């Protein structure tokens, strides 16, 4: 039985001081006003999952990182708030951090920003921006080994400019923007494992999303106990 | 179920600051270049165990300390490196630290240096010397209550002189050198519990080594999980 | 008979202080833990040479620099480690530094990074990165007048980002990245002397590699004496 | 052809600064008033050699150090001065430093002080004492890995007390005093290689001295060229 504090050690290469600072932030970061709740039950965001907003690839990248996929077009800003969408990432992260190999090799996330609207940007306030930067850098026990943005419209750079100043130099080096002709570049970073929609060979995004939705629903009892352990 | 961090508390008389510093070193000490691996499976050093290099007494000393015995003559430096020999002590220590009474009363080690050669000393580099001093003082959650050297040849003092400068005043007070006429002195420190070869009454070293070898092999599954919890 | 210390003078335009600092680093740089051995015998890396990984052009560039060619596709990371590959450059450098005209006009290296894999990047640790930067700047008596990277995949920039912070401003100005359409740009820097595979007119890479392999094997006695003069 | 400055590098583990300081002292140390001459021709001390004062063992110690033997009883202070006796060590040192394996593994010297008289001590002035300490520590490119004194009379400690304050902590750790029952202790440091007179099995001191005397006489042309290269 790995202690709860072991994931923080692995996240900081067993540097006790650094892991301590990470744990401190992990308990404080969401309490930043206006706070996001510690509620991690999928009932409030099951609609997002069924809309096909989010999924996790079955296979890891060539360095062992778990690969996450987000499709912004499947987020209706009139139905779900940024906090709801944020909650989806929290739920997923709390689940995949259980894997030791994820703890060691980190994660990489792919954001399909095709269909990004001003209504989306309206949700991203400075306070939200700060929280995004927090979990990317030093507030959650997951190594962010790479962030890949594809199909980014020109209007998105305003949003990213809100997040940028709160980002460390390390994470900034790991943020990639591919544009519309992403497939060649994206395939080089993720051989053999991408879905059909992004240059892959086997699985479709619909299947990948449905699989991860089932896993989240399946884990709703574990997600409840996590919620009660941070309040 | 005692938490993993309780053995560090007991090792420092429940001084939270001091136990914290010990845990920090416990995760860092082996990473000192050139590093020793976190691998604790007995497969790589089963030869040493079967050669009769190492054993643990069945009974404790009058103060409750576990008593460890090392015979340097049973270490062939042409077959096993200093790192392999070091690994044997790591494996044994990770096992006996599970006993609460060992956590409270510490350990005492007896090194039979009869048969110490220059080929042995060749293995003990300055880096190795530093690591020896580290686990003796502040890098492993075991109180070193005594170190007893017997049958030490005159050429050994060069080796000890490498270790000495990195030793604290407390541990230095606890290092004894008996020479060839050790039996009278050694019996006073360890009544009733020594093997036949060292003035004892009952058990032989061959039996003691065979018993501890079986226990190590028996614990190979626990030793694997420890290895995976420090990387 | 040119003294051994003359190549360090020529490398620093007969600035005695600067040449002294270079000689100091030349003796210390490989001892950085984890150290690379001073062994320069081609027996350990003959496989790399026969695989066509490395060769030296017969003719010099328009400024008199010796031109070196490396093909990363001919390096199998499952057979040869980064240290083995590093050793190949050490061996070549120790040979060409014997030429006075190379001492005066320096060298230029061309790295064909076509076929660069994550398995290659796995070998390039931070410690290795530091050593690469060391021999590029101030640890070997060869003026690096230019480094040319061709056919670089997008995933390589992560590796280069490890090396970059340890690079001086001078050397950084001398690192070129051409991409896939390199031929026009590469021909302007190296007229008349390139192999067929890179826009040249006469010789093939296979011939160039075979010629330099023979020369290395031919010089194995000189390479042994160098090894014994740095330990 | 190893440069003359390579022996200073090997003597200081290729630390360029430290080797530089050693070379500086090597040229200055004998010039300390009252100076000893740079003359290294055996003609002035052939009498000492034929008297059986000095010899070098054919075999090295278990660590590769050259082993030197001095017999103070064969020094007649009424015939040869301390400077003459000092010259013998200079001559021997300049010869054995030519061996690369001696440069790497250093030397160990055995002084048989049986027959030490006050007439001997009369020769050892404070200035002489300082010079003895100089060549032991930082004025000659030979690592002193050990000094062994045997058969030392009680009156010798006055002489050693003159040398002691000018000795570094490192060298002081390497000075052994065995007394009259030296054989057991001396054999442990030098197995298989000692002469008959000191617990050995094969060769006698008379043979060892005669062999080294021939070698010195044989090298008189090399010793002349060394003398002319330090003035
Ligand atoms: C532990 C962890 C969390 C919790 C996490 C992410 C990652 C990589 C993590 O490791 C990435 C996404 C994020 C920050 C949730 C983002 C919430 C907003 C609403 C997403 C849509 C708008 C973003 C402007 C789109 C770009 C996001 C990238 C700049 C990361 O939640
Ligand atoms: C937690 C712990 C470890 C890990 C440990 C020891 C003790 C008492 C511990 O509590 C004692 C032995 C040691 C340091 C391994 C020593 C490895 C070398 C190769 C032993 C042979 C050579 C030594 C020069 C012999 C003398 C050793 C004493 C000076 C300790 O490993
Ligand atoms: C004196 C000298 C040495 C010794 C040398 C080089 C040069 C130009 C020298 O002048 C260039 C190559 C290098 C640094 C060996 C590199 C070893 C690694 C394994 C090469 C493959 C991976 C590299 C990441 C590829 C890019 C290299 C460039 C950034 C230089 O060895
Ligand atoms: C490079 C080198 C030299 C040059 C050298 C020695 C050694 C080990 C060297 O490595 C040892 C002997 C010495 C210092 C010459 C000594 C001269 C006197 C006259 C010897 C007789 C009286 C001594 C009081 C006897 C004890 C000597 C030990 C304390 C070294 O010359
Ligand atoms: Cl909320
Ligand atoms: Cl990219
Ligand atoms: Cl190892
Ligand atoms: Cl005692
Ligand atoms: Cl190596
Ligand atoms: Cl260019
Ligand atoms: Cl004189
Ligand atoms: Cl002794």
Author numbering:
A (entry chain A), B (entry chain A), C (entry chain A), D (entry chain A): 48 to 278
From the paper:
Retention of α-Tol in animals requires α-tocopherol transfer protein (α-TTP) in the liver, a cytosolic transporter of 32 kDa weight. α-TTP belongs to the Sec-14 like family, a protein group involved in secretion and lipid transfer. α-TTP recognises and selectively extracts α-Tol from the endosomal fraction of the hepatocytes allowing for its transfer into the inner leaflet of the plasma membrane and eventually across the plasma membrane into the blood-stream.
α-TTPS crystallised exclusively when starting from monodisperse solutions of monomeric α-TTP. α-TTPS can exist in different oxidation states; we obtained crystals in both the fully reduced and the fully oxidised states. α-TTPS is formed by 24 protomers, for a molecular mass of 0.76 MDa, assembled into a spheroidal shell reminiscent of a viral capsid. The oxidised α-TTPS particle thus contains a total of 12 S-S bridges covalently binding all trimeric subunits. Oxidation is accompanied by local unwinding of the helical segment (aa’s 65–79). It also induces structuring of the neighbouring C-terminus (aa’s 275–278) into a regular α-helical motif. We notice that folding stabilisation of the C-terminal amino acid residues accompanies the maturation of α-TTPS. In the oxidised α-TTPS, it is involved in a strong H-bond and salt-bridge network of interactions with the partner protein.
